[PDB]
Amino acid sequence: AARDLICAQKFNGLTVLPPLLTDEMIAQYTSALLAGTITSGWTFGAGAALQIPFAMQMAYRFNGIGVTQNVLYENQKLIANQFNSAIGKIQDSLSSTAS
């Protein structure tokens, strides 16, 4: 086609070094953090992973803001659907509303 901008950057000594952690292992770090957050919770930040169901972890994270843990245990479906609709709103914002 025509001469690229990155070829002009590269040909004048302005080379770009790649990161040590590539996108696949960075995604592996992120997936390990997500799996430790869901399965182990906050207890894997103090040594090794300590397994927990996700409802218990969300309950013990409601306990950290002065809210009793009956709020989700009477309204688990509502909080789950609110999280699903909020992450769907984030997905639609990433799809269309680039702001």
Binding site: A46, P53, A55, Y73
Partner: protein, 106 residues
């Protein structure tokens, strides 16, 4: 203030800086158990204020989430605040009144 559950620290004089000695609580030896979000007893969903409901396979315990100190299920560290036909995860067990073995049986 240290990797893990932080307890305290010690300042130490150092050349062009400072050195801390973070005394830190770190758990070592784990053990697997059977858990449940609450306990349905007489249509009441007991679930603890501080402990976590675990069982070794036969009896259920209410020990804390950082050190295994299993205690019997009693309405002193458990609050109801609901009903047991709403939550997803629940098991059938019994919760003993603290009033009973010191006045009612006595």
């Amino acid at each position: 203030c240290g990797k893990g559950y932080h307890l305290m620290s010690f300042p130490q004089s150092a050349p062009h800086g400072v050195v801390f000695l973070h005394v830190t609580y770190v758990p070592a030896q784990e053990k697997n158990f059977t858990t449940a979000p609450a306990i349905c007893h007489d249509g009441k969903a007991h679930f603890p204020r501080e402990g976590v409901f675990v069982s070794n396979g036969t009896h259920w315990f209410v020990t804390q989430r950082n050190f295994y100190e299993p205690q019997i299920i009693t309405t002193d560290n458990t609050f109801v605040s609901g009903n047991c036909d709403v939550v997803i995860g629940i098991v059938n067990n019994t919760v003993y009144d603290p009033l009973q073995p010191e006045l009612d049986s006595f």
